[PDB]
Amino acid sequence: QMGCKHVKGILLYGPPGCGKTLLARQIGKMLNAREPKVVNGPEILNKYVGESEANIRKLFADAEEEQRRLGANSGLHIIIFDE
Amino acid sequence: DMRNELEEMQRRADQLADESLESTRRMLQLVEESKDAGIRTLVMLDEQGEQLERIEEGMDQINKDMKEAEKNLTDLGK
Numbered sequence A: 001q002m003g004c005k006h007v008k009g010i011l012l013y014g015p016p017g018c019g020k021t022l023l024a025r026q027i028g029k030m031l032n033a034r035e036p037k038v039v040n041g042p043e044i045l046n047k048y049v050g051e052s053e054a055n056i057r058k059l060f061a062d063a064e065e066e067q068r069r070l071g072a073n074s075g076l077h078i079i080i081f082d083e
Numbered sequence B: 001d002m003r004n005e006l007e008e009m010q011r012r013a014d015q016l017a018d019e020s021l022e023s024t025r026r027m028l029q030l031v032e033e034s035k036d037a038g039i040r041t042l043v044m045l046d047e048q049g050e051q052l053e054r055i056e057e058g059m060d061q062i063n064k065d066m067k068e069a070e071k072n073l074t075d076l077g078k
């Protein structure tokens, strides 16, 4: 009735080893979301043309297809970016 | 400027055979033998048909002869 969209992402910063991935996984598990995809920044880069972009692009395919199929009654997908 | 590009090479999977030369030869030999057997059966069947046709005429002749003889004997008897 209100017509309000949902928040699309958040950012967590702090010293290493203080429990950020734990919090992210717990948030994902609490909302009855599917298994999250965990990624690492330095491991995406590549030395061929159009390879890093493909890796970045490949993470949204499941959500895209599920929305195209089930419309507005789909589940919740979570993506976690580290570094 | 570590932007590399590549080119491609192709290989052809072996064509459909290397199993069509062991069962094949046996198949051909068996087909030849069956053809020979069929030819022999043809010849024998034609001979048998000729012999049956030959038998027919003697059969008819004996039937006619016996009927005529019986009728003649009956006619003379009475």
Ligand SMILES: Nc1ncnc2c1ncn2[C@@H]1O[C@H](COP(=O)(O)OP(=O)(O)O)[C@@H](O)[C@H]1O
Pocket (backbone or CB within 6 Å): A015, A016, A017, A018, A019, A020, A021, A022
């Ligand atoms: N607040 C916390 N309570 C309990 N264990 C914690 C906490 N913070 C960190 N840990 C422990 O430290 C480990 C590593 O933390 P991690 O999630 O890798 O932190 P970060 O994302 O900041 O590197 C966790 O698996 C857990 O064993």
